[PDB]
Structures are given as structure tokens and as C-alpha cells.
A and B are shown apart, each in its own frame.
With several copies, the nearest count.
Chain A
Amino acid sequence: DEDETTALVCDNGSGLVKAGFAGDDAPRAVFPSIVGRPRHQGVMVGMGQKDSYVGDEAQSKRGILTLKYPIEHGIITNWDDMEKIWHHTFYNELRVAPEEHPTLLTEAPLNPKANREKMTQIMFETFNVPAMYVAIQAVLSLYASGRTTGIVLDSGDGVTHNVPIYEGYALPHAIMRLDLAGRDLTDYLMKILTERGYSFVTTAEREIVRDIKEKLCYVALDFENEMATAASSSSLEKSYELPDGQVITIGNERFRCPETLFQPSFIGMESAGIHETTYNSIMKCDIDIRKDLYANNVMSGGTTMYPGIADRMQKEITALAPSTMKIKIIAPPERKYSVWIGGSILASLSTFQQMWITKQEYDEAGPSIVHR
């Protein structure tokens, strides 16, 4: 129990932090990855002067603060502001003292060696956690779907990745990163919806375009004869009621937004798209392992939640793969937390105890120890 209860799992994202206790089924804490700094001197009624704001209080009060994102494209870019988000996570969100809890953290696919050593330096030397561990994100997603070999298409708020994993070892030279994700996708909907003849003028109009994207957006299979369908004008249309009455209608654009993930050309991106990239990762891997990867395309991440994403991907890679092959696109329902759940499982596991980096290992080996 000492640490059975006690292991923490913190998944640091570009848009959201997911956090909680190893053992739980879902994150106890989910909140924006921002750190707000007040543009002016003054106070809220009853509070003192605050130097900084994190998560939702930074979002809610955004009009008087300069908002900053510590993690650009999955990589920690500002370490002063990240230590601020961690502090908030332990002390306010989970309300635990960190110096008696083992902490499993996550990093990104080709996270620079030096960063994995730096967050270890900050975990052990400024938070004084007993022990910690850094798992790679795609690797926890895979594992949370039971398996050990597969290829994960991972897509969240600032990055998309393909991480081919074989008997647990993520394959460095076959990993692909596509910098277009849910953030890019909300801003494109924004324009095709103002372009539908609308105005997201106040900040209460801006924010909810993102809630339109999440609730009403679709990834149609045969996106071709779906536009064609749009035109005959079926009961395909969908009206959402705004903060007030102002019933906005979205028929068609509803799927023009996730067609951006297959066609980056919709947004002036010259890069290849999700399905081709799944494939290219795969023809960059060893030959003998390619049947395995093909029958185990595990999807994880908030942006892979658009319904019919899996069917489109299913047919997208069948028709690029040699017919002798079995294609299989696994997309679980909890996928917006796969990464986290994979960490919860792993860290609560009976056999993981012997991989925890302890302060004994650290004080004796330097940050190098956990770096592997």
C-alpha cells in the first residue's frame, strides 16, 4: 500500500495535463497546460496579489494575464513555467505532498535525452519525490490496449505521431511526427464556420467553436460522396444552440474539419496525412515485423475521437497495404486517456516496483540513471 495507493501518474500534454493515482480508472485531474501572468497590478475581491495563475484560473481570467504554453508540440520548452504546472498538480489539484509519493511521468516520442535528465533533476531535487519513472506516451497507450507490438497513431492538442513499438521498444528510426492536431483543427473549423456566414466575435463565441468540433464533428468515410450528399441536402445538417438562443447551423463543415487530418492541403500544409504517414512508418520498419504493425494500429489521443476515424483509416491503409495483409485499426472508447490509463496499470503493477528510479539511485548515479 506504501506505494500501491501512493503512485502518481502525470501525463503532461500540449493542451491538457491528465493526473491522478495509479490504480484509478481515469485521471483525477484534467486541466489546461497554461500559466498566466497578470498584465496589470490589482486584486480579486478577498484575495491577495497573485503572481501567477495555472490551469483553469488562467483560462477564466485570460483577459488580464499573458497566457503561456510550457509544452510546445509535446516537448517542454519552458522549465520555469513547467515546474509551476507540476506544483499546481501536486499541491492543489491532487492535494498530495509529493515527498512521499512515487511519480510516473510521461514524455514524448523523440524527447531529447537532456530533457528526460532535466525533469528528473526537478522531480528529485526541487519536489523531493521518493522515486519516479518516465514512460514514452505511445508506449503507454499500446500497453493499455493489452499489447506490446503495434503502431500507435497518437494525436492530441499540438502533435501527431506514429510510434511503431516491438516487444515494448519504440522504434526510433520509424517514428513520424506531424505538427497538426486538435488546436489547428479548432482554428480551421472557426474559419469554415465564419465562412458559412458567421461571427465568433466575443471570447464566449471563440471558446465554444471548440465544443462544436468535439460534439458535432465527424470523419466520414467516402468524404467524396459526402460533399455530394451535402448538396442534395439531406437531414445531414446539425444546429447547435449557443451560450444564448442564437442557434447556429452546421451541416456540411461538420466533416470538412477532420478531412483536414487526411488532407493537410486544406490548411496550407504540404506534409503528408495521417494514413499515409501510418503507412510510411510501416515501410520504414523491418520487413518481418510489418504484418504485426498492420494488424495493430492502436489509436490514442483527443483528436482521434472524431467518430468514423477508424473506418476511414481502416480503408485508407487496406488500400495502400499489399492484399496479402491483415489490417486492424484498434480505437478504444477511453482513448482520450489511453496514455494515462497505460501508466496507471503499469505503475500499479506488481512487477514495476523494480524499475522505479529511487533517490538512492539518483543521489548516487546523477540524472543519467533514469535517462537509460
Chain B
Amino acid sequence: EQEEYKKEGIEWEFIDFGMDLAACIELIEKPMGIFSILEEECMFPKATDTSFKNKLYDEHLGKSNNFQKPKPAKGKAEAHFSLVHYAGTVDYNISGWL
């Protein structure tokens, strides 16, 4: 986009459109994010899906915006955690993950 306004000579300033999504990505891929908590617990010989779950919350819940506790009803089957992806809210079930 920015090339055009540069080619033409228009005066339009704008922030990267990607940026809007960085929030969600960090939450997943960053160090204290989902995957990590997921892959750490996998090291605990006596961890539970339930265990994992709590770790997920204690650390992201209330502190993270893209992080949310599910909406259990509608066409959904159970509760664990929703995320706020660009496309929308996804209700995730954590069972077997470990």
C-alpha cells in the first residue's frame, strides 16, 4: 500500500496491519504462552490435563486479553478456553493434549 502513496505522492500515514495480530501470536508462541505451558507440563511425570489447565489460567487469565474462559453453550460441547483469533473466538477443549 505504502508504496503507492509514495509513488503517487499522497500523504497517508499508517501503522503495519500485521500488528493487530501480534497479540494473539505472542500468547501462543512466546515463552510463558500456551505451547510452553503445554510442553513443560509434559515433563512432569504426574501432570494432568487438569493440572495443565490450571497452569494455563493462573498465568494468563485476567492478565491476558486474548485469553478468556469459555462460553460453554451454543453449539459447543464443553468448557476450557477461548482465544481471540483474527477470524473470531475459538473455544478450545484441552483433553488428551498432554
Contacts and interface: CB of A to CB of B under 8 A. Distances in A.
Contact between chain A and chain B defined by CB under 8 Å: yes
Contact of B48 (A47, A349, A352, A355): A47
Contacts of A148: 44, 46-47
Contact of B49 (A41, A48, A143): A48
B33 to A, nearest CB: 7
B82 interface: no
Interface string B18-62: 000000000000111101111111111111111111110010000
B59 to A, nearest CB: 9
Nearest to B40: A351
B53 A48 contact: yes
B47 to A, nearest CB: 7
Interface string A310-352: 0000000000000000000000000000000000011011111
Given A43-B50, A49-B54, A356 B31 contact: yes
A43 B51 CA distance: 6
Contact of B32 (A48, A49, A348, A354): A354
B77 to A, nearest CB: 17
A351 B38 contact: yes
A148 B42 CA distance: 13
A223 to B, nearest CB: 33
Nearest to B47: A43
A350 B33 contact: no
B31 A353 contact: yes
B43 A354 contact: no
Interface in A192-220: none
A45 B50 contact: no
Given A41-B54, A48-B51, A49-B51, A351 B36 contact: yes
A42 interface: yes
Given A41-B55, A49-B54, A354 B45 contact: no
Contact of B43 (A46, A49, A346): A346
Given A354-B30, A354-B33, A356-B31, A45 B39 contact: no
Contact of A147 (B37, B46, B58): B46
A349 B42 CA distance: 7
Contact of A350 (B40, B45, B50, B54): B40
B29 to A, nearest CB: 10
Nearest to B52: A49
A47 B43 contact: no
Interface string B79-92: 00000000000000
B49 A350 contact: no
A268 interface: no
A47 B39 CA distance: 19
Interface in A42-85: 42-43, 45-51
Contacts of A145: 45
A351 B48 contact: no
Interface in A3-55: 41-43, 45-51
A353 B29 CA distance: 10
A334 B40 CA distance: 22
Given A41-B55, A49-B54, A353-B31, A346 B45 contact: no
A348 B45 contact: no
Interface of B: 30-33, 35-55, 58
17 contacts: A43-B54, A45-B46, A46-B48, A47-B48, A49-B53, A51-B54, A143-B45, A146-B46, A148-B47, A346-B43, A351-B35, A351-B37, A351-B38, A351-B41, A352-B39, A353-B31, A354-B37
- Please list the 8 inter-chain residue pairs (A to B) with the smallest Cβ-Cβ separation, ordered nearest first: A350-B39, A48-B50, A351-B40, A146-B45, A354-B31, A354-B32, A49-B54, A349-B43
Given A349-B40, A353-B39, 14 more contacts: A43-B50, A43-B51, A46-B48, A48-B50, A49-B53, A346-B40, A348-B43, A349-B41, A350-B39, A351-B38, A351-B39, A351-B40, A352-B43, A354-B33
